[PDB]
Coordinates of all heavy atoms in Angstrom, one line a residue:
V157 N 4.1 12.8 -0.9 CA 5.0 12.6 0.2 C 6.0 11.5 -0.2 O 5.7 10.4 -0.7 CB 4.3 12.1 1.5 CG1 2.8 12.5 1.5 CG2 4.4 10.6 1.7
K158 N 7.3 11.9 -0.1 CA 8.4 11.0 -0.4 C 8.4 9.9 0.7 O 8.5 10.1 1.9 CB 9.7 11.7 -0.3 CG 11.0 10.9 -0.7 CD 12.2 11.8 -0.4 CE 13.5 11.1 -0.8 NZ 14.6 11.8 -0.2
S159 N 8.2 8.6 0.2 CA 8.1 7.6 1.2 C 7.8 6.2 0.5 O 7.1 6.1 -0.5 CB 7.0 7.8 2.2 OG 6.4 6.7 2.7
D160 N 8.3 5.2 1.2 CA 8.0 3.8 0.8 C 6.5 3.7 0.9 O 5.9 4.2 1.8 CB 8.8 2.9 1.7 CG 8.4 1.4 1.5 OD1 7.4 1.0 2.1 OD2 9.1 0.7 0.7
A161 N 5.8 2.9 0.0 CA 4.4 2.7 0.1 C 3.9 2.0 1.3 O 3.0 2.4 2.0 CB 3.9 2.0 -1.2
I162 N 4.6 0.9 1.6 CA 4.2 0.1 2.8 C 4.4 0.9 4.0 O 3.5 0.8 4.9 CB 5.1 -1.2 2.8 CG1 4.7 -2.1 1.7 CG2 4.9 -1.9 4.2 CD1 5.7 -3.2 1.4
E163 N 5.4 1.7 4.1 CA 5.7 2.5 5.3 C 4.6 3.5 5.5 O 4.0 3.7 6.5 CB 7.0 3.3 5.2 CG 8.2 2.5 5.2 CD 8.4 1.7 6.5 OE1 8.4 2.5 7.5 OE2 8.5 0.5 6.5
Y164 N 4.2 4.2 4.3 CA 3.2 5.2 4.4 C 1.8 4.5 4.8 O 1.2 5.1 5.7 CB 3.0 5.9 3.0 CG 2.0 6.9 3.0 CD1 2.2 8.2 3.6 CD2 0.7 6.7 2.5 CE1 1.3 9.2 3.6 CE2 -0.3 7.7 2.6 CZ 0.0 8.9 3.1 OH -1.0 9.9 3.1
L165 N 1.5 3.5 4.2 CA 0.2 2.7 4.5 C 0.2 2.4 6.0 O -0.8 2.7 6.6 CB 0.1 1.4 3.6 CG -0.3 1.6 2.2 CD1 0.1 0.3 1.4 CD2 -1.8 1.7 2.1
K166 N 1.2 1.8 6.5 CA 1.3 1.4 7.9 C 1.0 2.6 8.8 O 0.4 2.4 9.8 CB 2.7 0.8 8.2 CG 2.8 -0.6 7.7 CD 4.0 -1.4 8.2 CE 5.3 -0.7 7.8 NZ 6.5 -1.5 8.4
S167 N 1.4 3.8 8.4 CA 1.2 5.0 9.2 C -0.3 5.6 9.1 O -0.6 6.5 9.8 CB 2.1 6.1 8.7 OG 1.6 6.8 7.6
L168 N -1.1 4.9 8.3 CA -2.5 5.4 8.2 C -3.4 4.6 9.1 O -3.2 3.4 9.4 CB -3.0 5.2 6.7 CG -2.1 5.7 5.6 CD1 -2.5 5.0 4.3 CD2 -2.2 7.2 5.5
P169 N -4.5 5.2 9.5 CA -5.5 4.5 10.4 C -6.3 3.5 9.4 O -6.3 3.8 8.2 CB -6.4 5.6 10.9 CG -5.6 6.8 10.8 CD -4.8 6.6 9.5
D170 N -6.8 2.5 10.0 CA -7.6 1.6 9.1 C -8.9 2.3 8.6 O -9.2 3.3 9.2 CB -8.0 0.3 9.9 CG -6.8 -0.6 10.2 OD1 -5.9 -0.7 9.4 OD2 -6.9 -1.3 11.3
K171 N -9.5 1.8 7.6 CA -10.7 2.3 7.0 C -10.5 3.8 6.7 O -11.5 4.6 6.9 CB -11.8 2.1 8.0 CG -12.5 0.8 7.9 CD -11.8 -0.3 8.6 CE -12.7 -1.5 9.0 NZ -13.7 -1.1 10.0
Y172 N -9.3 4.2 6.3 CA -9.0 5.6 6.1 C -9.2 6.1 4.6 O -9.7 7.2 4.4 CB -7.6 5.9 6.6 CG -7.1 7.3 6.5 CD1 -7.7 8.4 7.2 CD2 -6.0 7.6 5.7 CE1 -7.2 9.7 7.1 CE2 -5.5 8.9 5.6 CZ -6.1 10.0 6.3 OH -5.6 11.2 6.3
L173 N -8.7 5.3 3.7 CA -8.7 5.7 2.3 C -10.0 5.5 1.5 O -10.7 4.6 1.6 CB -7.5 5.0 1.6 CG -6.2 5.3 2.1 CD1 -5.1 4.4 1.5 CD2 -5.9 6.8 1.9
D174 N -10.2 6.5 0.6 CA -11.3 6.5 -0.3 C -11.3 5.6 -1.6 O -12.3 5.3 -2.1 CB -11.5 8.0 -0.8 CG -12.8 8.6 -0.6 OD1 -13.8 7.8 -0.8 OD2 -12.9 9.7 -0.2
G175 N -10.1 5.3 -2.0 CA -9.8 4.5 -3.1 C -8.3 4.5 -3.3 O -7.6 5.4 -2.9
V176 N -7.8 3.5 -4.1 CA -6.4 3.3 -4.3 C -6.1 3.2 -5.8 O -6.8 2.5 -6.5 CB -5.8 2.1 -3.5 CG1 -4.3 2.1 -3.6 CG2 -6.2 2.3 -2.0
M177 N -5.0 3.8 -6.2 CA -4.6 3.7 -7.6 C -3.2 3.2 -7.6 O -2.3 3.8 -6.9 CB -4.7 5.0 -8.3 CG -4.2 5.0 -9.8 SD -5.2 4.1 -11.0 CE -4.3 2.8 -11.3
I178 N -2.9 2.1 -8.3 CA -1.6 1.5 -8.3 C -1.3 1.3 -9.8 O -1.5 0.2 -10.4 CB -1.6 0.1 -7.6 CG1 -2.0 0.3 -6.1 CG2 -0.1 -0.5 -7.7 CD1 -1.9 -0.9 -5.3
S179 N -0.7 2.3 -10.4 CA -0.4 2.3 -11.8 C 1.1 2.1 -12.1 O 1.9 2.9 -11.8 CB -0.8 3.7 -12.4 OG -0.7 3.6 -13.9
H180 N 1.4 0.9 -12.7 CA 2.7 0.6 -13.1 C 3.7 0.7 -11.9 O 4.7 1.3 -12.0 CB 3.2 1.5 -14.3 CG 2.4 1.3 -15.5 ND1 2.9 1.2 -16.8 CD2 1.0 1.2 -15.7 CE1 1.9 1.0 -17.6 NE2 0.8 1.0 -17.0
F181 N 3.3 0.0 -10.8 CA 4.1 0.1 -9.6 C 4.5 -1.3 -9.2 O 5.6 -1.5 -8.8 CB 3.2 0.7 -8.5 CG 3.8 0.7 -7.1 CD1 4.8 1.6 -6.8 CD2 3.5 -0.3 -6.2 CE1 5.4 1.6 -5.6 CE2 4.1 -0.3 -4.9 CZ 5.0 0.7 -4.6
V182 N 3.6 -2.3 -9.2 CA 3.8 -3.6 -8.8 C 5.0 -4.3 -9.5 O 5.7 -5.1 -8.9 CB 2.6 -4.5 -8.8 CG1 1.4 -3.9 -8.0 CG2 2.2 -4.7 -10.3
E183 N 5.2 -4.0 -10.8 CA 6.3 -4.6 -11.5 C 7.6 -4.1 -11.0 O 8.7 -4.7 -11.3 CB 6.1 -4.4 -13.0 CG 6.1 -2.9 -13.4 CD 4.7 -2.3 -13.5 OE1 3.8 -2.7 -12.7 OE2 4.5 -1.4 -14.4
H184 N 7.6 -3.1 -10.2 CA 8.8 -2.5 -9.6 C 9.0 -2.9 -8.1 O 10.0 -2.7 -7.5 CB 8.8 -1.0 -9.7 CG 8.9 -0.4 -11.1 ND1 10.1 -0.4 -11.8 CD2 7.9 0.0 -11.9 CE1 9.8 0.0 -13.0 NE2 8.5 0.3 -13.1
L185 N 8.0 -3.5 -7.6 CA 8.0 -3.9 -6.2 C 8.6 -5.3 -6.0 O 8.3 -6.2 -6.9 CB 6.6 -3.9 -5.6 CG 6.5 -4.2 -4.1 CD1 7.1 -3.1 -3.3 CD2 5.0 -4.4 -3.7
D186 N 9.4 -5.5 -5.0 CA 10.0 -6.8 -4.7 C 8.8 -7.7 -4.4 O 7.9 -7.4 -3.6 CB 10.9 -6.7 -3.5 CG 11.1 -8.0 -2.8 OD1 11.7 -8.9 -3.4 OD2 10.6 -8.2 -1.6
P187 N 8.7 -8.9 -5.1 CA 7.7 -9.9 -5.0 C 7.3 -10.3 -3.6 O 6.2 -10.5 -3.3 CB 8.3 -11.0 -5.8 CG 9.1 -10.3 -6.9 CD 9.8 -9.3 -6.1
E188 N 8.3 -10.4 -2.7 CA 8.0 -10.8 -1.3 C 7.4 -9.7 -0.5 O 7.0 -9.9 0.6 CB 9.4 -11.2 -0.6 CG 10.0 -12.4 -1.2 CD 11.5 -12.2 -1.5 OE1 12.3 -12.2 -0.5 OE2 11.9 -12.1 -2.7
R189 N 7.1 -8.5 -1.1 CA 6.5 -7.5 -0.4 C 5.1 -7.2 -1.0 O 4.3 -6.4 -0.5 CB 7.4 -6.2 -0.4 CG 8.7 -6.4 0.3 CD 9.7 -5.3 0.0 NE 11.0 -5.6 0.5 CZ 12.2 -4.9 0.2 NH1 12.2 -4.0 -0.7 NH2 13.3 -5.3 0.8
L190 N 4.7 -7.8 -2.1 CA 3.5 -7.6 -2.8 C 2.2 -7.9 -1.9 O 1.3 -7.0 -1.8 CB 3.4 -8.4 -4.1 CG 2.1 -8.3 -4.9 CD1 1.9 -6.9 -5.3 CD2 2.1 -9.2 -6.1
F191 N 2.2 -9.0 -1.3 CA 1.1 -9.4 -0.5 C 0.8 -8.4 0.6 O -0.3 -7.9 0.7 CB 1.4 -10.8 0.2 CG 0.2 -11.3 1.0 CD1 -0.8 -12.0 0.3 CD2 0.2 -11.2 2.4 CE1 -1.9 -12.5 1.0 CE2 -0.9 -11.7 3.1 CZ -2.0 -12.3 2.4
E192 N 1.8 -8.1 1.4 CA 1.7 -7.1 2.5 C 1.1 -5.7 1.9 O 0.2 -5.2 2.5 CB 3.0 -6.8 3.1 CG 3.0 -5.7 4.1 CD 4.3 -5.4 4.8 OE1 5.4 -5.6 4.2 OE2 4.3 -5.0 6.0
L193 N 1.7 -5.2 0.9 CA 1.3 -4.0 0.3 C -0.2 -4.1 0.1 O -1.0 -3.2 0.6 CB 1.9 -3.8 -1.1 CG 1.3 -2.6 -1.8 CD1 2.0 -1.3 -1.3 CD2 1.5 -2.7 -3.3
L194 N -0.7 -5.0 -0.7 CA -2.1 -5.2 -1.0 C -2.9 -5.4 0.2 O -4.0 -4.9 0.4 CB -2.3 -6.4 -2.0 CG -1.7 -6.0 -3.4 CD1 -1.9 -7.2 -4.3 CD2 -2.5 -4.8 -3.9
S195 N -2.4 -6.2 1.2 CA -3.1 -6.5 2.4 C -3.3 -5.2 3.2 O -4.4 -5.0 3.8 CB -2.3 -7.5 3.3 OG -3.0 -7.9 4.4
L196 N -2.3 -4.3 3.2 CA -2.4 -3.1 3.9 C -3.5 -2.2 3.2 O -4.2 -1.5 3.9 CB -1.0 -2.4 3.9 CG 0.0 -2.9 4.9 CD1 1.3 -2.3 4.6 CD2 -0.5 -2.6 6.3
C197 N -3.5 -2.3 1.8 CA -4.5 -1.5 1.1 C -5.9 -1.9 1.6 O -6.8 -1.0 1.9 CB -4.4 -1.7 -0.4 SG -2.9 -0.9 -1.1
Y198 N -6.1 -3.2 1.8 CA -7.4 -3.6 2.2 C -7.8 -3.0 3.6 O -8.8 -2.5 3.8 CB -7.5 -5.1 2.2 CG -8.8 -5.6 2.5 CD1 -9.7 -5.8 1.4 CD2 -9.3 -5.9 3.8 CE1 -11.0 -6.2 1.6 CE2 -10.6 -6.3 4.0 CZ -11.5 -6.5 2.9 OH -12.7 -6.9 3.2
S199 N -6.8 -3.2 4.5 CA -7.0 -2.7 5.9 C -7.2 -1.2 6.0 O -8.0 -0.8 6.9 CB -5.8 -3.1 6.7 OG -5.8 -4.5 7.0
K200 N -6.5 -0.4 5.2 CA -6.6 1.0 5.3 C -7.7 1.6 4.4 O -7.9 2.8 4.4 CB -5.2 1.6 5.0 CG -4.0 1.0 5.7 CD -4.3 1.0 7.2 CE -3.1 0.5 8.0 NZ -3.2 0.7 9.5
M201 N -8.3 0.8 3.6 CA -9.4 1.2 2.7 C -10.7 1.1 3.5 O -10.8 0.3 4.4 CB -9.5 0.3 1.5 CG -8.6 0.8 0.3 SD -8.3 -0.5 -1.0 CE -9.7 -0.2 -2.0
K202 N -11.6 2.1 3.3 CA -12.8 1.9 4.0 C -13.8 1.2 3.1 O -13.5 0.9 2.0 CB -13.4 3.3 4.4 CG -13.6 4.3 3.3 CD -14.2 5.6 3.8 CE -13.2 6.2 4.8 NZ -13.8 7.4 5.5

């Protein structure tokens, strides 16, 4: 799905994901958005 990662994550229910893979992505993410991204992964991961 074409979409910003944070936007997509926000659209998911908590405890929804089975596992997350972030390969060569963070070095392309604006530093001020890193925390939120990861924080969202935690919330949406079961």
Side-chain angles (χ1 to χ4, degrees):
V157 338
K158 184 190 179 188
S159 149
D160 170 276
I162 291 161
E163 292 297 302
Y164 182 78
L165 280 161
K166 287 193 293 181
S167 83
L168 313 159
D170 290 325
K171 277 78 161 289
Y172 182 65
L173 300 173
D174 235 316
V176 183
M177 176 71 250
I178 302 184
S179 188
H180 299 224
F181 176 77
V182 304
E183 59 264 36
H184 292 284
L185 186 65
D186 157 66
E188 293 132 73
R189 298 167 187 165
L190 179 60
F191 188 77
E192 172 179 35
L193 174 81
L194 291 179
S195 185
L196 284 170
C197 288
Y198 190 84
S199 287
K200 310 310 182 168
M201 273 165 85
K202 55 181 59 187

